[PDB]
Design an enzyme around this catalytic site. Sequence first.
Site, PDB file in Angstrom:
ATOM      1  N   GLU A 427       0.811  -1.218   0.000  1.00 21.45           N
ATOM      2  CA  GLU A 427       0.000   0.000   0.000  1.00 21.45           C
ATOM      3  C   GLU A 427       0.846   1.270   0.000  1.00 21.45           C
ATOM      4  O   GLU A 427       0.662   2.156   0.831  1.00 21.45           O
ATOM      5  CB  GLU A 427      -0.997  -0.037   1.152  1.00 21.45           C
ATOM      6  CG  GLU A 427      -2.107  -1.041   0.887  1.00 21.45           C
ATOM      7  CD  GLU A 427      -3.246  -0.991   1.886  1.00 21.45           C
ATOM      8  OE1 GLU A 427      -3.416   0.055   2.545  1.00 21.45           O
ATOM      9  OE2 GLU A 427      -3.982  -2.004   1.994  1.00 21.45           O
ATOM     10  N   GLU A 508      -4.229  -8.913  -0.329  1.00 16.65           N
ATOM     11  CA  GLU A 508      -4.857  -8.707   0.967  1.00 16.65           C
ATOM     12  C   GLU A 508      -6.347  -8.714   0.826  1.00 16.65           C
ATOM     13  O   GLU A 508      -6.901  -7.909   0.091  1.00 16.65           O
ATOM     14  CB  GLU A 508      -4.415  -7.386   1.570  1.00 16.65           C
ATOM     15  CG  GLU A 508      -4.107  -7.466   3.051  1.00 16.65           C
ATOM     16  CD  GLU A 508      -3.533  -6.177   3.584  1.00 16.65           C
ATOM     17  OE1 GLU A 508      -2.300  -6.030   3.537  1.00 16.65           O
ATOM     18  OE2 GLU A 508      -4.313  -5.307   4.038  1.00 16.65           O
TER      19      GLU A 508
END
Length: 847
Positions: A427, A508
């Site tokens: 991220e 994820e």
Amino acid sequence: VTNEEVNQMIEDRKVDFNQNWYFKLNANSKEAIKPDADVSTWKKLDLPYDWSIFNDFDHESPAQNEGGQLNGGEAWYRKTFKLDEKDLKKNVRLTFDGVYMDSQVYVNGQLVGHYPNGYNQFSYDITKYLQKDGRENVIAVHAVNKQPSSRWYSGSGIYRDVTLQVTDKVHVEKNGTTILTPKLEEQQHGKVETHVTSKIVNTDDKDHELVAEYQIVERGGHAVTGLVRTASRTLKAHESTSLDAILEVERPKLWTVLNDKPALYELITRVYRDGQLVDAKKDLFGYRYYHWTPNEGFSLNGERIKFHGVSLHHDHGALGAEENYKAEYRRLKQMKEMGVNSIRTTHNPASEQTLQIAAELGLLVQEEAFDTWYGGKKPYDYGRFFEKDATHPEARKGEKWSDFDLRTMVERGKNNPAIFMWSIGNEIGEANGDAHSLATVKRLVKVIKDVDKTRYVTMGADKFRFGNGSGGHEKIADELDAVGFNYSEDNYKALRAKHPKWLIYGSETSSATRTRGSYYRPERELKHSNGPERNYEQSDYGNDRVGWGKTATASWTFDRDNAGYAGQFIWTGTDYIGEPTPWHNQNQTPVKSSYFGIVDTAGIPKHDFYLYQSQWVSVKKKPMVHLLPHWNWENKELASKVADSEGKIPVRAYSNASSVELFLNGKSLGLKTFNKKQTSDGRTYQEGANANELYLEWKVAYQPGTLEAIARDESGKEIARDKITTAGKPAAVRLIKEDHAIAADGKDLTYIYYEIVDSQGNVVPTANNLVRFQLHGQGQLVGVDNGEQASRERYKAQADGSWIRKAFNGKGVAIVKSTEQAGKFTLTAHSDLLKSNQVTVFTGKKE
């Protein structure tokens, strides 16, 4: 020289350096370094030691509850040691598996190095800093955790092992072995060429004549080659070279995740200087191959599998950041019991233990270097070091910390069969496709490929879930071997159409939130439900998920329904300290630990564990059925949230079987059958009343007693039962041993569960009774836990040396470590007005 001697040399080459350290928080720098410091004011201990875990929770902590509300600070660790007489001319290297963070290492008053990274392994050649004559040396380690440094619980200090390598001046350098099997798919039914490379250094000021000798063996097995020798050549003083050989191994057994004891091999390296054996080493490896396509996903050894994966933090609950082989083994063995074949080490390098256990248990690993690049996510995280020059003695010219850290992690794990993916970011907001980020991804990919081309370079990106998922970030994904989608199942179809050549997986997924034994509104799906009526708890029906999240069913069914989405790494496999979403950084609330895990911090499964098991484990390997919720509904407040319009309690069964029949007090409530279906690509699967239910349900009017479920194959033959029973009032504490015995090495440990039970031995599923623990004999209590997110209880001993912990929903765990003396230990448990219990565990020989 006998084979016996060669093995001894291997074994002597590396030792445990964890013992006999002194610790002091906020210690004086000059005293910590100095030769004969006064350590009466220091704490004597054996590593690993996480200092943060012994703290009380602090609502005012700079970490906040994302960091577990446990404070950091600064501290020093101190060891004194003498080289043996034999070892005086030898090269000495010190390896730290992980130190959090910003460390400085001093040897006899001089700074060997500064190392920012809190998770990456590092070593120093400390030979030149050592005293001549075998006079004692002083090693001093400074660790700084200044908060906030973390988006989750990090711990502080030397939380992973420290090791010492003592070698000849001519030796295989750290991380110097490379093992490849380029033609394995081709050669597998015959002789497989194993290409080995050795990187030998001559630290002497004399030239020496160099030969390498290699042999391969099965790990815990026999030799599968003879001795294969490199040609003698000169290695000049202060120089290094790379040696090569090919060994042929016949019909080797292939490492796979499809069994729980996969085949492992070891390369043995012997180094001769001027014809004398001076160094000997072993390196673990395996024979496996894999392929991955856009529309079909992944195959291992020609078998198509999906990544049934979990994201894991490092973190061991009551153990805090202290890594332990047995703790990690238990976590990973348990993941594997669920049908997990894959872990992601989110978001940071793994320990030696994790990587080894994964190779041993057959779990594919994605190891992740960075949670940020140059931008940073927290002020005192890695971002600030990312582009600065590596100052490590052995850093190459022009290497940044990111370069050096990524390089060294890959060199460490290049030969580990378990690792198939290298992640260069999670991220990363700054990775938006601008010139800087585009340069950075290419630089980073190239670091890896200069070391290892065999594994997929990847990133986990949540940018793909915003809008239609498209943007400048797509340019960054183009540079990766495989592209990880975080919470982006909704845009997959579109992104897949746009990028037909991308290899896509869920890096994820889910982020469903649950509290074990807590139930709320099964009939609804609850999105980011963090109201006061929630009492800081989330639902074990699995109907709670964060705003960006999906339930286990939603996230798994999607993965299952699409072949080109290779798998997923669920957030999270087990709970971790910190990140208590949906109460994230609401610091005046009591929450300090995560709701994301399938399993709680205490190692006790939540109900979704069984949901996954029903989907991921074959009915042939392990037939099962699992019931929820409990059968104690006397309390109106509890029941008002669970019971429907008619006051019935929805009872649900997870099973991999064909049918489940539910009985209340011996009376059938009907037999129900899973609906069988196929994926467009012909994979077969089972589901319930509709596509959004993987369970079978009964609406049961509450009559106290026993619910029992009979699971059957298609023939109508019973293959599994489960059973839930209404409990009476708490009468006693019951202790449940995982192990009858453990090893007496001071490292092995055992987990003993405590339950609150009624007079019939039923677990009281609502019970929060406080339990007091006594330990006698050859053991050390090292933790207590109940998994409950809202608990602010010590995980460690109380200030008076006591060990206490509450049950949460009937259960908890205590953790006992062995000593180095054989014998036994006994754990006694007490609770107020309840009967007490003890169990005894033996300590002694190993395996």
